[PDB]
Design a protein around this ligand. Sequence first.
Ligand SMILES: Nc1ncnc2c1ncn2[C@@H]1O[C@H](COP(=O)(O)OP(=O)(O)O)[C@@H](O)[C@H]1O
Ligand SMILES: Nc1ncnc2c1ncn2[C@@H]1O[C@H](COP(=O)(O)OP(=O)(O)O)[C@@H](O)[C@H]1O
Ligand SMILES: Nc1ncnc2c1ncn2[C@@H]1O[C@H](COP(=O)(O)OP(=O)(O)O)[C@@H](O)[C@H]1O
Lengths: 239, 407, 62, 51, 228, 371, 230, 248
Amino acid sequence: SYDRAITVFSPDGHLFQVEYAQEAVKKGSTAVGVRGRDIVVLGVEKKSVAKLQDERTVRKICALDDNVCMAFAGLTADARIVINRARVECQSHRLTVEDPVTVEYITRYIASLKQRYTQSNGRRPFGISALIVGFDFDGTPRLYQTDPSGTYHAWKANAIGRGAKSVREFLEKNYTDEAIETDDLTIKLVIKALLEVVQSGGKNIELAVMRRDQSLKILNPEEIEKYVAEIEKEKEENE
Amino acid sequence: IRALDEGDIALLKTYGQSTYSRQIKQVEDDIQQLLKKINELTGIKESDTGLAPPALWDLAADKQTLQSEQPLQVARCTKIINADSEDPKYIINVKQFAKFVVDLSDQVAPTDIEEGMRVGVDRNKYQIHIPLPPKIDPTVTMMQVEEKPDVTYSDVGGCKEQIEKLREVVETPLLHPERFVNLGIEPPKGVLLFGPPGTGKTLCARAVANRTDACFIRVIGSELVQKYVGEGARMVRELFEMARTKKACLIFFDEIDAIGGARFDDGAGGDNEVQRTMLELINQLDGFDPRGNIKVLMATNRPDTLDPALMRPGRLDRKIEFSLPDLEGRTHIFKIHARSMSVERDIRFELLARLCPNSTGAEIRSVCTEAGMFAIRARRKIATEKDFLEAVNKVIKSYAKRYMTYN
Amino acid sequence: CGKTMLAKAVAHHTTAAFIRVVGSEGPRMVRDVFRLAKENAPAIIFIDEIDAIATKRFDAQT
Amino acid sequence: AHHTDCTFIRVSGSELVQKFIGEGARMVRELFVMAREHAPSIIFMDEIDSI
Amino acid sequence: YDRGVNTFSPEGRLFQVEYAIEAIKLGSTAIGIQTSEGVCLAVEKRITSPLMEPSSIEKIVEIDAHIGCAMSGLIADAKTLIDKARVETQNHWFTYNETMTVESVTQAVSNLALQFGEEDSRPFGVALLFGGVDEKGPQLFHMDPSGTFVQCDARAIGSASEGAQSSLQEVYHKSMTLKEAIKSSLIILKQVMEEKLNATNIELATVQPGQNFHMFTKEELEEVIKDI
Amino acid sequence: SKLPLVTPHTQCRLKLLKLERIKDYLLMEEEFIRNQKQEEERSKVDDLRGTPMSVGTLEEIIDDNHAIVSTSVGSEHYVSILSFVDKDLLEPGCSVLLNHKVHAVIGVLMDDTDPLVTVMKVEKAPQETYADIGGLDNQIQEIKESVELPLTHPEYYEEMGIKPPKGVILYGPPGTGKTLLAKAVANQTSATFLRVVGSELIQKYLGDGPKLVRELFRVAEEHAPSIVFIDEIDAIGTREIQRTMLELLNQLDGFDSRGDVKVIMATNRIETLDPALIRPGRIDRKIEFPLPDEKTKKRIFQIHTSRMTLADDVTLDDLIMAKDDLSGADIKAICTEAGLMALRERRMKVTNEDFKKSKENVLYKKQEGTP
Amino acid sequence: GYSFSLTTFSPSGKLVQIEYALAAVAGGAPSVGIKAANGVVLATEKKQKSILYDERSVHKVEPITKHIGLVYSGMGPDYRVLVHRARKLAQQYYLVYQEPIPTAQLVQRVASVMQEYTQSGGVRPFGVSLLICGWNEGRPYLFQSDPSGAYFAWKATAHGKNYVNGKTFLEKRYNEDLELEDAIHTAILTLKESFEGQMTEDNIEVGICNEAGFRRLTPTEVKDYLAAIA
Amino acid sequence: RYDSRTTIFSPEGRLYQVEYAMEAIGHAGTCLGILANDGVLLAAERRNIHKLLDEVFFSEKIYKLNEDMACSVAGITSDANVLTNELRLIAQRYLLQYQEPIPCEQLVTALCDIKQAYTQFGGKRPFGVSLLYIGWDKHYGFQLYQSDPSGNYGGWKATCIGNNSAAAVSMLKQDYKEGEMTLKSALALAIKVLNKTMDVSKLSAEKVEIATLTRENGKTVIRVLKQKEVEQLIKKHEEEEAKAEREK
Ligand SMILES: Nc1ncnc2c1ncn2[C@@H]1O[C@H](COP(=O)(O)OP(=O)(O)O)[C@@H](O)[C@H]1O
Ligand SMILES: Nc1ncnc2c1ncn2[C@@H]1O[C@H](COP(=O)(O)OP(=O)(O)O)[C@@H](O)[C@H]1O
Ligand SMILES: Nc1ncnc2c1ncn2[C@@H]1O[C@H](COP(=O)(O)OP(=O)(O)O)[C@@H](O)[C@H]1O
């Protein structure tokens, strides 16, 4: 009894289709999220504006809350679908619940949606993983990751996509146990990670910052290039 | 871009050279041609022949025997006419040559010649004079072990009950037939060994072969499985005949799962031929005619897969289970493997055994070896408990070797 | 209707040798019959009801 | 193949399939055996997309 | 006989949920001990990286202020089972005001587990261990994807459950104090499973009849580490 | 025998001097050979084996000097053995020279049968060396400890009482140098090298698979110090094919004593390998071949572009940089295609931009798929 | 091939089942529909297996509305279910908009239902090619719909057995300023070319749309055009 | 089999069926949205080639969603028809709810979302249609969008799909113009790319269908080009190639 399906198990017990969804996520581009001392930063790479293409339309970073934002890496159609579901869920929770939305609740909602979409015949699972950063952890920053297995986890800093194997080790190489003072330093570390882009140019990295109390903040290419220059100056110290 | 015009390659390979090009390529061509000249001058190398050390051989006896004796041809005997038993007459078959009616020589006797019997015969009269042994297939006769492995029962760890019960059948009746005969009991004649891979089944077979003292024949699945039909059955026939020739014999089948697969028909006939071979075997073990003093050993990793007729007692009388070693067995095998090494005297082996998960004896030998490589890579002439713990870690983590399906 | 009759009659009147294979009878067979045809220079090959093997090509599954 | 004076060897991908396991491997390896024994040569696989 | 549970093999065995037991096997282990002093659960995290928040992996959970749970297998299906157990306890207590017997919690979760070919998906590839207390006794229970459940005094589930179960069987008796049973569980998990104890990859949860608070063990493993 | 290895490769007079040294020596060979008994032994033996002598097969040996021999007509003859024939060199299946008239055994002929495995004996390792491979140092020490050190210096293991490791699997993405490392270790220790490519042991004939592996191990042990390489073991590794697996596993672990032959098995899909073939008892050494890092990539670029004429403007670092996206084979592809691109525009001295567009085009041809 | 299932794509992007339906089409009854300067003429044959079959009992040209005439490719029962659906759809449009259904719009709705049958894994499309003649706002319209759900406008066309000859015929035997009488003559001529065997009042039936109204020919008129003419 | 059902991934995670839908789009008639400012255009040459084709609508490729919205068609004919009807339905929903014109990106996302939902569920065949949108809205004004069967959508200033789509986008990136490249230059470039992609020497007027949106009175107009304007456009391009010849 090989896989051939979504709701049957291999003789050793593994469900192969969720693994195939994991591989489909692995095909996607890089996405490395972190949480700092107070702020959370994000940087997406491999924009690859195709001359006639205008980059803005694709919206590789999307915000669906009073304050929460990131896209979902993988197939962008499932990304837009889950974007619509996240909009609906966050607005409904804010309108219906006595208190506003929290990052844990929306992360659990997304995980449960993926699980309930997987747990049936004739229903293709969402082959997309995401990195959620929220503000209201009782006024603290925190980061979650969502996996098409309908699973959610809480990272201090995580990477998914084409560089998932690499950047994570990079994180394990230098994610400072000292909480990042001057969260601009954490943003510079994120820029250094984005220097490991699929094109590695660093001139088209789209970055977002949110200080756990602020709304969504977007970093323009020139000011992001300023942090890239600071990181390059730090790197040139080896002389 | 235009293609490389002949002038373009000319200038490409001319302008870009060093001022050395001509000399060193010409010198290389001289290398090649001088090599060929040396080869032709020295001639070809003498392939030679046998020709044992010169002082060992010849004597005029060699040529005298060559010019005096007869290069006898070999013929299948058949149908002793025995028309009057004063001169019996025989039929002979010279393979791919002919069939003759012949008589004995002045040397051989009628009692010395039987039907078939693969006799020899002269080259022009075709009179029969030599008793020759029957044709045993070479690919069957090389199967006899001819050399005992360097393993004893003391090298097998933990399986005291298994080795006792197997020696009860494969060793005790040969060593002490008196116990069985004076008590008037018939001992078992077939032992099957089953268990997970790497538990020591082939090691037990090696120990038995070392302590057998009788004719021991190993058997492997690939040996029996020929391409042509019936040929494997033929080899098993010859193998059992060979076993009958010996005064008692031991037959060992390693991984009999290769041939003993249960018979099935609906698969468009299935493998069938392998089933035919194992059917000839299932007859030879117990069919018409008593098997003889032939005690038989099979070891397999899939006991349930074999055909039920092969599991049947009277052909497989005693079935033995080699399970994963217990803590005491793990300690014992660790001792046994550590006997040969140069290690610390104070190695607390039972600690290592209780660090071991449900590890087969193959894993024990592997971790012992990994400690050996740790010591050697450290260039130390003594293996230490630290080396053993790194070996345990290496082996266990290697066997353990996204995985988000876990809890 | 006489396809095989008329092919046979043409072969008999001419110096040709008449080889015949029915389409219900893989590509190795086609190469073999063509090679056999080559062995006799004026030979004639006849395929009977070739439609079974010469049906329209699409994306084939099995 | 004609102009470069190298030998021409042709084996179609449809010819590669065969009805038995262990034959395509053998046939390809021995095809390159003829390729090497003929020395300067070109190997053609017409309709390699069939496999 | 591979499409689903609705097919019977010649030996009667459904060739779908044996793979569910094998899916129990692929998951990380969980240990449970039932003692007169208290019922305890131990759980291995199998932590991929220290950048992970170790508590984020919910392989040890609190069903209610009188019952905790550990489990092995698939984490999402386990979380669904845990959610049902919690809402069942909430509803039953809010309605009847009587404490939910842990066995009743197992019954409800098992009845959910019987919802793949019994109505109108697939078996829940996860096995659970419950440890709870009630007005009539402290209990430990185990259940599997098949929907069956059993009362156990010392149970091991997940990967390498055989060796840990053998050690747990050999060390267990009916008169252990919770301290000695806990310590035996920790030393067994240390020797067989991964390594020396640490707060990053192992978790403990104990339940006592008179203690509805602090159902877990947290930020106090230090006294263990030096004295283990 | 072969020529020495001249190890300048740039066109310099050092290369010349080495060459004319070699020419001097070969010319002395020519001189010496051009500037140019046992008739009793010959008159006895080579006249007893009166020409011509037929070639047949030995089947059985019955007496000290009596044996059964078949010939190409298929007939069977009980003949005598002359004393000069080495008895220990005679066994069933051996090719034997026979007197034409009286068919008497007059010597053993060195074997010229079993053609296929005779071809796969290759022994043609010397195209590479540990030199040709750069950066795979952990793998190098691992395989050295496993197979190379026991062959070169079994003294350490015998003194330690250690039975050496008896199986190695190499794994990793393709183009990482597993085959190169196997050939290189075959070159370092001149033990006979045996290579057999995966699926090629899968055969249509029912016996041919296990039979082929049996004869390959037979020839390997016949050569005694030997290394056997099975690349893409996955083709077999992942009843008949399982029976070939059983044959190989038993040839590894099973009865008899194997001795000195070492086994290297290379796979691209190690995780798909069946548990049986990965024997903890036999296969204790699994060597991963990761995609090369920055240092390893730099080493491979230097190794491959070393033999090419290079311009000054080539900045190797921008080629090395980005990530571990590719393997050594891809690096060789970039070097080769950069050579062709320099050739088209008529450079015999490749430049930096050549490598830049070469890596760009390779990355274009690397993988595919709709966005 | 990829024909046993209707709801899947082939590697080349073809859904083989619907061209199988189109192969069922053009294997059925031959028929030709042309557009004249004033009106639209659709002609189809009536030839059964045996003389017992009273052919007048089964009309093939059916008036969807007094201004719409409909002909099919030969798939009888599928044509009947589809023509019932088309009649009901035309009635819905006639009552909703209080105006008669446009010919192009009617064909659009019919092809929409056709497409509705081109999905799921337990149904099959009606392998029928539909020729629709109509009058709308003083303009004549001839449309063709096919089981794939597609529809197109033809000045002249034909389908059924031997349809390529009808295509060539309407290629060289047509001009857009044909009068109605000459249009019917062209239709019966291409019917003669496409059909095998002679025809009488029994063997053909024709429907003509004129801007005042549509009407199916009486067999006597069908013989008047087919016999004693051409 | 993996490729038989849309809900099964490859072991690499790729989906075969939507890929087959794109290779289907490979057969589609060449059609592009051209690069224009202060205006936009959707040229779509008709693959329909036969004398007796009536083309009574005079438009079968470009469909007007509203006087500020037009869409192109490249895919399965019936799927395209039902999809265009669904576009008009969704625009009607948005307008009836808000009494405001729908933004380009919102409508495009809505259609692509329902397409993805249809592809996601089992027992249903993915819509083998890719399409282009030309529109003007409050938020961004002139916009051209491209959408695929998978439900992916994006913004392109100049793009082409259908027959030789890769070649078309290639020469569009070759002689790419920006800024002062107004609507008339867009017509010229569209004529150039259509003559290059199509095999017809002296490309015929009836073979090509062109439409364009321009902001008149702030209420906007979408004009589908009639025969005459296409005629002198093609003739002017022919004499422009003649002028390019005159340079030699
Ligand atoms: N109980 C044991 N005592 C000593 N050595 C053992 C034991 N079990 C396994 N080994 C070692 O591991 C190897 C096991 O091989 P074995 O299990 O006999 O192969 P197979 O499973 O094919 O019969 C032996 O070579 C032996 O050296
Ligand atoms: N025109 C014919 N005249 C006489 N006999 C015929 C004719 N056509 C067919 N037959 C008979 O039919 C038999 C088989 O015909 P065959 O040549 O196989 O026709 P086809 O090739 O069309 O099947 C012949 O034995 C022959 O007697
Ligand atoms: N570390 C390396 N050093 C030098 N060459 C390498 C290296 N890795 C790969 N190569 C190149 O790749 C090829 C070997 O690929 P390899 O990985 O051995 O194939 P396989 O995957 O079949 O074992 C050789 O041509 C070699 O030049």
